[PDB]
Design a protein around this ligand. Structure first.
Ligand SMILES: [Cu+]
Length: 71
């Protein structure tokens, strides 16, 4: 698997949940970096993981996640 930006749409509305997704994402094996956009309700994930896996990882933050595509 090679490094790419995954651009996901997610269910959140306040600043504590953004940070909870960022800290569920932080330190994961196969993630380089992230950028989280509460203003688009979007999540960028710079990763070698399959987007099927990152969806189920994002789902592990208590909310739904739907991919839009790659950067
Ligand atoms: Cu919140």
């Amino acid at each position: 698997g090679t490094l790419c930006t995954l651009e996901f749409a997610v269910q959140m509305t306040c600043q504590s949940c953004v940070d909870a997704v960022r800290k569920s994402l932080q330190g994961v094996a196969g993630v380089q970096d992230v950028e989280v956009h509460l203003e688009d309700q979007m999540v960028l994930v710079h990763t070698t993981l399959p987007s099927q896996e990152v969806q189920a990882l994002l789902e592990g933050t208590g909310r739904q996640a739907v991919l839009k595509g790659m950067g």
